[PDB]
């Protein structure tokens, strides 16, 4: 049936998947709308699927490593079903990219440069990391996958590359690291016993606590700057800070949810900004 | 099965005839060569040498001299042939070259050869090593060259030059490992059986030289995609 495999399609998702895949694309289209003044419904869905596919295909690379020790829904899983699904997802991504090229007005050399170089550039340096150093090599993927999704989404809409869409996507890049780090924190003893190495294990219990707070409270300082100096509309993400204090006190469902609220208010901040009130637009 | 046999044949062929192939290679390179912003370079040259030293200090752990001596001799000739080609297609480019040089695959094939027990067995070990490390390296050298190669069509001048050095690095790096290196590693061990890496390596080798399938399948799709990007950008457009 379809449901028994719909329960298999959750295998390529992580708790930070929404924040890494879909929030950037939504921000990028908002930037494109705020900058140029015309937005396309079709290209938004294409970008949304093209990014998720490449994300999911990358998550299965990590999923395959969980057959090493026996770390691995309610069915008997074999290492063929992972390979078949990763291949399918990545092919879906490339087909979406081809349709985006045909519909949009972006030059093919640049679309390839971003899509194959940036989004799909992860696959080049993973495969050799091993099941121990996955979580450690994942910080590097999340730092770069966030801003490039925003640029990819922006470029496909407008028709040329820019530089500011990377700068606007720092808060969303940090908020995702907060989720990954908070997830790595609670699995410290298990990963240490199994022989796995993460950042939270390397730095220790208290430096993890300092890093978590840094990653949590930087976005609010960036929005505090942008609010008062650039546009009063962009203070809307600061309505979540009582939740951030509660999270700092209780120390990742709550963190993952905070990111969703922050991302939503950030996009609604960019849309509601006055004309020519934001830098470089 | 079909490719492994082919790379086996190549490995054995090169391993059997060292002196002729190395002369031919060097002669070809002689016939090629003799025929006719600071901050960015600083940070790149600071990180590159650290990466090289990390890899050397990783190799240091094995506790043998010949592996270092062989890994050293691969680097020199790869750096030399790159210098030939980069001169022919034109000091400052080495920071990007030393990032793309692959000493792990150079060390691996040497470790296969060092686990031998007799002068006849060394060649067969090189062939067996070549069969495992041939396809895996060819696919990486294909993908990385196409991926860096897409940046040479972008428009930005710094990027168009930085990517060109990368392409010519990867190709010149691959060609050496395929032609010159197996003969060299054969000849060094030929002219010299005091190489103990059997009991440790003979278990881990056939498990280690296996990448992730989910990566290796995606690389073929990426390869097949980039070929269309290139083919469409050059001829049709």
């Amino acid at each position: 049936s379809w449901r028994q495999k719909c329960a298999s399609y959750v295998l390529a998702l992580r708790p930070w998947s929404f924040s890494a895949s879909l929030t950037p694309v939504a921000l990028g289209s908002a930037l494109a709308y705020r900058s140029q003044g015309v937005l396309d419904p079709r290209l938004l869905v294409g970008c949304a699927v093209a990014v998720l596919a490449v994300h999911g295909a990358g998550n299965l690379v990590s999923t395959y490593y969980d057959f090493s020790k026996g770390i691995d829904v309610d069915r008997i899983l074999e290492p063929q079903d992972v390979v078949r699904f990763g291949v399918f997802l990545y092919t879906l991504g490339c087909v979406c990219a081809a349709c985006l090229y045909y519909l949009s007005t972006l030059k093919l050399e640049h679309l390839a440069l971003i899509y194959f170089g940036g989004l799909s550039g992860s696959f080049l340096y993973t495969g050799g990391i091993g099941f121990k150093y996955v979580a450690l090599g994942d910080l590097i993927i999340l730092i770069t996958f966030g801003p490039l999704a925003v640029m990819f989404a922006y470029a496909v809409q407008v028709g040329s590359l820019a530089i500011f869409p990377l700068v606007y996507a720092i808060p969303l890049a940090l908020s995702t690291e907060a989720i990954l780090h908070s997830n790595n924190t609670r699995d410290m003893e298990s990963d240490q016993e199994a022989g796995i190495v993460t950042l939270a294990i390397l730095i220790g219990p208290t430096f993890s606590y300092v890093l978590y707070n840094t990653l949590l409270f930087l976005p609010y300082l960036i929005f505090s700057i942008l609010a008062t100096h650039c546009s009063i509309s962009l203070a809307l993400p600061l309505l979540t800070i009582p939740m951030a204090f509660s999270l700092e006190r209780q120390f990742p469902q709550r963190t993952a949810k905070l990111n969703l609220l922050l991302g939503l208010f950030y996009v609604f901040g960019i849309i509601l900004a006055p004309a020519g009130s934001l830098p470089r637009l | 099965d079909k490719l492994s046999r082919l790379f086996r044949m190549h490995g054995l062929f090169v391993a059997s005839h060292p002196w002729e192939v190395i002369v031919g290679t060097v002669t070809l390179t002689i016939c090629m060569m003799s025929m006719n912003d600071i901050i960015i370079l600083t940070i790149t040259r600071c990180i590159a040498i650290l990466y090289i030293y990390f890899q050397f200090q990783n190799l240091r752990q094995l506790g043998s001299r010949y592996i270092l001596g062989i890994a050293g001799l691969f680097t020199i000739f790869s750096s030399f042939v790159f210098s030939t080609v980069v001169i022919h297609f034109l000091n400052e480019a080495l920071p990007f070259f030393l990032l793309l040089i692959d000493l792990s695959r150079a060390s691996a094939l040497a470790k296969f050869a060092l686990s031998s027990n007799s002068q006849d067995e060394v060649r067969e070990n090189i062939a067996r090593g070549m069969a495992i490390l041939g396809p895996t390296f060819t696919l990486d050298a294909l993908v990385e060259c196409l991926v860096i190669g897409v940046g040479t069509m972008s428009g930005v001048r710094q990027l168009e030059i930085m990517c060109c050095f990368g392409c010519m690095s990867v190709l010149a790096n691959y060609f050496v490992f395929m032609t010159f290196f197996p003969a060299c590693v054969s000849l060094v061990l030929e002219l010299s059986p005091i190489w103990q890496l059997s009991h440790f390596a003979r278990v881990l080798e056939e498990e280690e030289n296996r990448p992730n399938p989910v990566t290796q399948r995606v690389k073929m799709i990426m390869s097949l995609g980039l070929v269309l990007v290139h083919a469409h950008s050059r001829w049709i457009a």
Partner: antibody
């Protein structure tokens, strides 16, 4: 049509070691796991372990951790199991068994039984 | 080790009448059970997977039921080809453990 051809009966002495081959033919050998089941006298099936043929990443049952070590031969499509330090209790049939073709299937393809005798 | 149990040890039947077994688990194992049929001098041959889903190639008389802890396999009309031993296996947690075995009789 997948079949898992298996080795013939083996007579041995106490303290020896034995090796059994399960020549898996009819599919992509490195795609699926290769499990092992022991049917002792009295008709009680017990799960020994599994092996990933691609890597060789084994994963045993805690009861059979010491005296059963699985290896693989990727060249000839053959999965092995080595029983060490045998006793009178280890006289049993041993099956090799892998999962169904598609997702959400249980163990359809079994071997034939290597009648080990101590 | 999720210990499984089974309740006639030897079941005496007649040809035509309905029969039922009972693979009652120790823990809650969801809907993960598998019923194998082993004849004389043969291998186990899968009949029902995950307690209800029939296998293509098996006669339609084999029908599984139940969930949670108690599971039941039932045959409606036994023939000469149903006289065998029936084991149940859980594939929920590792190691996978089989039942005891329920033998048929005329």
């Amino acid at each position: 049509e997948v079949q898992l051809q298996q080795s013939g009966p083996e007579l041995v002495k106490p303290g020896a070691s034995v090796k059994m081959s399960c020549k898996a033919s009819g599919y992509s050998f490195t795609g699926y796991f290769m499990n092992w089941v022991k049917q002792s006298h009295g008709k009680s099936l017990e799960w020994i372990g599994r092996i990933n043929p691609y890597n060789g990443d084994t994963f045993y049952n805690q009861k059979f951790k010491g005296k059963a070590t699985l290896t693989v031969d990727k060249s000839s499509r053959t999965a092995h199991m080595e029983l060490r330090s045998l006793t009178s209790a280890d006289s049993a049939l041993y099956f090799c068994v892998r999962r169904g073709e598609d997702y959400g299937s249980s163990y359809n393809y079994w071997g034939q039984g290597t009648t080990v005798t101590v | 080790d999720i210990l499984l149990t089974q309740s006639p040890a030897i079941l005496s039947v007649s040809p035509g009448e309905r029969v039922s077994f009972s693979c009652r688990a120790s823990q809650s194992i969801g809907t993960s059970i598998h019923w194998y049929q082993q004849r004389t001098n043969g291998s186990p041959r899968l009949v029902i997977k995950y307690a209800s889903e029939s296998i293509s190639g098996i006669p339609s008389r084999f029908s599984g039921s139940g969930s949670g802890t108690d599971f039941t396999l039932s045959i409606n009309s036994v023939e000469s080809e149903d006289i065998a031993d029936y084991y149940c296996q859980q594939s929920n947690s590792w190691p996978y453990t089989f039942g005891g075995g329920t033998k048929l009789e005329i």
